[PDB]
Amino acid sequence: SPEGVTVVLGAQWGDEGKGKLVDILAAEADICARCAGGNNAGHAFNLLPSGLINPECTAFIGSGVVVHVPSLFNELDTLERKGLKVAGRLLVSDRAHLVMGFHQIVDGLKEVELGGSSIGTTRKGIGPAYSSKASRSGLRVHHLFDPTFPAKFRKLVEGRFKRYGHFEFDTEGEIEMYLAFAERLRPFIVDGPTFMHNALSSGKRVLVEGANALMLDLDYGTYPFVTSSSTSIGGVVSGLGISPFAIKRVVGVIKAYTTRVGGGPFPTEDLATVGETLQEVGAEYGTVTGRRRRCGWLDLVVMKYSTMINGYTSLNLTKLDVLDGFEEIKVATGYKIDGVEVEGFPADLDRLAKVEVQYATLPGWKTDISNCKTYEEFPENAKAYIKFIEDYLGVKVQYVGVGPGRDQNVIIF
Amino acid sequence: APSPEGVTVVLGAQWGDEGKGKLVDILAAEADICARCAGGNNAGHTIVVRNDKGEKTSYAFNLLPSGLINPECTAFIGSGVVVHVPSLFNELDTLERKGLKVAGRLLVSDRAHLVMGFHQIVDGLKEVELGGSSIGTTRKGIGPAYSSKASRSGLRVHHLFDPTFPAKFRKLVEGRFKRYGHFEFDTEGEIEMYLAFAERLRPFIVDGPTFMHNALSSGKRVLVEGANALMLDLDYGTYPFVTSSSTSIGGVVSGLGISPFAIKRVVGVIKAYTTRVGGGPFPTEDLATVGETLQEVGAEYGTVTGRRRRCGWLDLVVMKYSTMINGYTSLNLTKLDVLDGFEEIKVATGYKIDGVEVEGFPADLDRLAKVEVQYATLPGWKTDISNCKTYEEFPENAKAYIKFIEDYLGVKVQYVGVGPGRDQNVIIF
Numbered sequence: 001s002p003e004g005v006t007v008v009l010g011a012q013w014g015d016e017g018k019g020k021l022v023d024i025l026a027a028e029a030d031i032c033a034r035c036a037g038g039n040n041a042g043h044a045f046n047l048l049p050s051g052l053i054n055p056e057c058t059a060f061i062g063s064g065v066v067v068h069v070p071s072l073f074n075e076l077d078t079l080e081r082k083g084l085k086v087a088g089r090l091l092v093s094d095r096a097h098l099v100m101g102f103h104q105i106v107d108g109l110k111e112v113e114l115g116g117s118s119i120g121t122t123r124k125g126i127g128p129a130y131s132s133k134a135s136r137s138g139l140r141v142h143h144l145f146d147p148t149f150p151a152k153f154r155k156l157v158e159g160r161f162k163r164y165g166h167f168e169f170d171t172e173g174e175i176e177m178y179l180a181f182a183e184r185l186r187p188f189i190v191d192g193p194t195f196m197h198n199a200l201s202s203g204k205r206v207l208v209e210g211a212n213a214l215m216l217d218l219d220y221g222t223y224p225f226v227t228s229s230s231t232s233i234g235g236v237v238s239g240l241g242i243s244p245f246a247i248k249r250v251v252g253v254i255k256a257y258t259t260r261v262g263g264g265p266f267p268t269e270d271l272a273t274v275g276e277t278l279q280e281v282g283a284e285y286g287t288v289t290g291r292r293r294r295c296g297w298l299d300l301v302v303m304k305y306s307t308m309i310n311g312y313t314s315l316n317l318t319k320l321d322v323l324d325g326f327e328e329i330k331v332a333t334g335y336k337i338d339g340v341e342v343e344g345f346p347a348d349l350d351r352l353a354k355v356e357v358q359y360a361t362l363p364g365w366k367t368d369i370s371n372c373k374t375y376e377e378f379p380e381n382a383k384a385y386i387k388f389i390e391d392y393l394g395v396k397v398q399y400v401g402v403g404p405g406r407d408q409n410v411i412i413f
Numbered sequence: 414a415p416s417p418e419g420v421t422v423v424l425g426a427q428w429g430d431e432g433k434g435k436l437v438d439i440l441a442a443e444a445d446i447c448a449r450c451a452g453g454n455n456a457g458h459t460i461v462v463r464n465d466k467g468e469k470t471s472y473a474f475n476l477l478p479s480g481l482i483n484p485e486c487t488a489f490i491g492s493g494v495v496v497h498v499p500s501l502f503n504e505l506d507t508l509e510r511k512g513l514k515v516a517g518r519l520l521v522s523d524r525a526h527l528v529m530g531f532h533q534i535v536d537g538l539k540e541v542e543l544g545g546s547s548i549g550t551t552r553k554g555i556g557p558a559y560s561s562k563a564s565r566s567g568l569r570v571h572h573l574f575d576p577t578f579p580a581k582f583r584k585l586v587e588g589r590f591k592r593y594g595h596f597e598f599d600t601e602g603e604i605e606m607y608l609a610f611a612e613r614l615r616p617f618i619v620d621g622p623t624f625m626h627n628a629l630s631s632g633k634r635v636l637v638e639g640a641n642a643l644m645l646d647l648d649y650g651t652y653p654f655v656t657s658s659s660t661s662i663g664g665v666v667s668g669l670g671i672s673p674f675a676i677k678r679v680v681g682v683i684k685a686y687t688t689r690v691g692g693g694p695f696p697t698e699d700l701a702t703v704g705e706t707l708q709e710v711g712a713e714y715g716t717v718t719g720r721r722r723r724c725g726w727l728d729l730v731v732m733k734y735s736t737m738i739n740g741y742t743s744l745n746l747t748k749l750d751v752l753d754g755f756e757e758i759k760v761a762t763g764y765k766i767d768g769v770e771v772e773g774f775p776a777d778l779d780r781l782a783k784v785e786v787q788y789a790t791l792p793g794w795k796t797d798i799s800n801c802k803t804y805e806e807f808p809e810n811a812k813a814y815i816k817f818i819e820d821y822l823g824v825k826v827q828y829v830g831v832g833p834g835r836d837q838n839v840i841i842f
């Protein structure tokens with residue numbers, strides 16, 4: 001690992017296995033950071049950087065993140081209860097924005113207001129928090145120590161009532177609770193820009209855990225079926241307030257098949273037995289919610305676009321073991337509209353809907369690879385699958401996931 | 414001096430109005446593509462060109478990249494921008510009537526967001542609603558457009574060709590009516606106007622990611638004209654007295670959808686004294702004769718009622734912070750001539766709160782309000798430098814001012830502005 005920043009980014013529509021790779025690479029990092037997004041889960045980490053199992057790794061929450069403070073401490077207190085010493089190893093930018101209870105409520109209210117046109121958000125208030133941020137009415141970590149916090153909070157609620165009508169919300173109770181958490185948060189708070197600048201100047205190795213994934217990027221994803229932050233490489237630069245020159249590696253986490261959860265287009269979605277098999281074998285459902293994910297074939301048209309935006313220096317191909325039982329595996333290699341090859345990935349979703357997907361069909365290996373520890377142990381047709389992806393995308397696969405465990409990662413170089 | 418293949422960025426380093434236009438003009442001569450990556454129509458530049466008959470012509474740019482002044486350049490509006498389409502075409506048509514060809518050389522990302530008439534209206538309504546706590550926005554709808562973008566209700570360039578555009582537009586109006594009450598707005602007339610602009614815009618529309626990727630892979634020189642400035646950055650500026658885009662270097666990466674590895678040069682535009690427009694603290698602000706002198710000699714008035722500029726000494730605590738975030742490869746020191754009449758010049762070198770040295774720049778504005786500013790006092794040069802064309806010509810104490818800034822920030826000054834005229838610059842290296 002070089003001095004400077006190594007980034008782990010999700011390449012598709014999330015749930016690729018970023019947390020797993022971060023836990024692995026954090027063994028070689030001084031600092032593990034979140035740069036954007038809010039609380040969404042990885043395998044017990046949600047808001048906290050997934051590198052904290054390394055006892056000596058420091059966790060940092062950047063200015064680009066939106067933080068639901070009660071959830072942060074529920075997460076922290078649980079980790080500590082399990083025996084992990086986190087409290088002295090966690091720093092939070094005083095410029096991070098605050099997700100409030102009413103953000104979570106109006107997230108759902110808007111989704112209902114949309115009816116059939118709903119996005120399928122996680123209902124965690126992420127969009128409303130980022131919209132308040134853009135408006136500059138949003139509250140930030142430093143406001144927790146500002147005597148005007150209650151007045152500003154009340155006005156925020158009043159504005160949501162105007163927009164969405166009355167809803168039940170204990171405004172004064174929520175204010176009281178947040179200020180109570182402020183006392184617990186105080187020791188974690190830092191000036192983010194100077195913290196990161198000092199780290200980089202000192203020759204530290206910084207590992208950045210991207211949230212969500214590229215096709216959920218507010219600018220470059222399948223808008224409006226996206227999250228409300230930059231999930232892509234620019235979000236690292238902005239979210240941590242660092243120079244682009246500090247970025248040394250950008251690892252793209254690419255699942256061996258495609259998933260998305262929530263609404264929007266999905267060109268290689270399978271609505272029959274393949275999709276069901278990927279869902280079951282790949283355990284593609286929410287850990288607490290049971291929220292089942294849409295599944296389909298690997299889509300390298302998506303990956304070509306993803307690579308164009310993020311500029312991956314290498315790939316982590318994940319969940320390859322989920323395909324161990326397949327006789328044949330399809331991989332999307334092109335989109336056509338009206339018999340004509342499509343350039344790049346379309347911004348217009350009605351154009352995307354006209355796409356006829358072109359597939360390669362590759363033979364399966366029909367072998368359990370979950371105990372493979374080196375590239376040479378892979379079955380020939382698994383090797384072929386890896387090479388097919390590399391050759392198509394022009395980026396080498398550096399890491400292969402063959403099971404959920406920390407140990408089930410094959411390092412190729 | 415040749416520009417490198419890849420991306421050169423011009424960024425404002427303070428609170429705007431530094432004087433970015435002249436450097437963009439200088440660097441556009443060595444650019445293939447000139448791009449806007451974020452922000453809206455607050456990048457007003459006028460470039461005055463002398464022709465082969467010795468006559469001067471003034472060309473005005475705002476949404477359009479100023480590098481169009483180079484007739485061989487292509488202009489690009491990135492995905493991260495918010496576009497008021499009526500303004501865009503007013504700007505374009507004004508230039509073409511003056512003989513500057515724009516159509517055919519202008520490309521617009523189909524993922525850029527649209528600033529609508531109702532965004533401008535509610536910008537104002539919110540500002541009124543805030544009373545004494547107003548931000549001092551330019552009332553151009555920029556915040557409301559970025560808020561709608563974050564909500565994912567906002568409309569993008571591709572929607573102009575979408576059969577559901579009228580229905581979606583109506584729903585957006587309806588939402589603003591719920592939040593702010595009914596204001597006068599000709600919804601159906603506006604829809605019609607936008608469908609008309611859509612046909613004018615059709616030839617310009619491009620897939621932004623592909624356009625830029627192909628440009629970079631074919632070795633093009635891309636100049637990015639940053640809008641606003643670092644201390645107006647949504648994340649890193651004096652929030653809430655900031656704009657609603659990333660004005661910092663990350664907004665280039667996001668706004669153009671490129672790899673950070675494509676960034677080659679990042680020039681920070683640092684005015685020789687500090688100005689602010691809008692509320693909140695201003696550590697080096699002068700409310701007496703120095704501030705009045707800076708305002709008059711620097712012509713720091715702006716073009717809109719209520720936006721006359723607050724003026725103060727150069728603040729290098731601000732500039733250290735700005736440099737940390739943006740990673741400048743060199744600096745453009747502007748309006749150095751505005752100090753030509755000063756006997757002594759103060760420069761902020763440190764902040765203290767409660768006797769202790771603040772490190773970096775404080776996120777909390779109540780802490781910022783408490784800062785005790787430490788100043789260096791430098792001797793003036795008391796000579797007119799506005800006809801200087803080479804570094805050697807500078808008076809010793811102007812040289813000393815430059816060097817003081819360099820040594821403090823650890824970044825060299827490459828370009829010095831010594832007047833408003835197109836060629837009133839000194840290139841040091």
Ligand SMILES: Nc1nc2c(ncn2[C@@H]2O[C@H](COP(=O)(O)OP(=O)(O)O)[C@@H](O)[C@H]2O)c(=O)[nH]1
Pocket residue numbers: 010014015016017018019020021041042043282283318319320321322400401402403404405408
């Ligand atoms: N079978 C299998 N499961 C994996 C693998 N990698 C990760 N997982 C699991 O797949 C799911 C997605 O991983 P996670 O780290 O939470 O994704 P993230 O949101 O991108 O951080 C989790 O349930 C993981 O335990 C793999 O290589 N094989």
Ligand SMILES: Nc1nc2c(ncn2[C@@H]2O[C@H](COP(=O)(O)OP(=O)(O)O)[C@@H](O)[C@H]2O)c(=O)[nH]1
Pocket residue numbers: 425429430431432433434435456457458459710711747748749750751829830831832833834
């Ligand atoms: N006296 C003086 N005026 C300058 C100088 N550089 C730029 N200006 C003027 O400052 C004003 C703001 O410049 P502009 O390029 O529009 O600034 P921007 O807001 O940073 O993009 C313009 O009227 C310039 O002509 C300089 O070096 N000296």
Ligand SMILES: O=c1[nH]cnc2c1ncn2[C@@H]1O[C@H](COP(=O)(O)O)[C@@H](O)[C@H]1O
Pocket residue numbers: 013014015040041119120121122123124125126127212216225226227228260261262263
């Ligand atoms: O961690 C994640 N995994 C998978 N999808 C996500 C995740 N976070 C957000 N999304 C999706 O992003 C879109 C917006 O959700 P939001 O981020 O809750 O506003 C929806 O399609 C979500 O399902």
Ligand SMILES: O=c1[nH]cnc2c1ncn2[C@@H]1O[C@H](COP(=O)(O)O)[C@@H](O)[C@H]1O
Pocket residue numbers: 428429430455456548549550551552553555556641645654655656657690691692
């Ligand atoms: O170009 C600029 N020069 C100086 N201040 C600006 C500029 N653009 C935005 N601002 C300031 O940024 C804040 C937000 O304005 P907005 O970008 O119109 O929303 C206000 O304090 C403005 O005065």
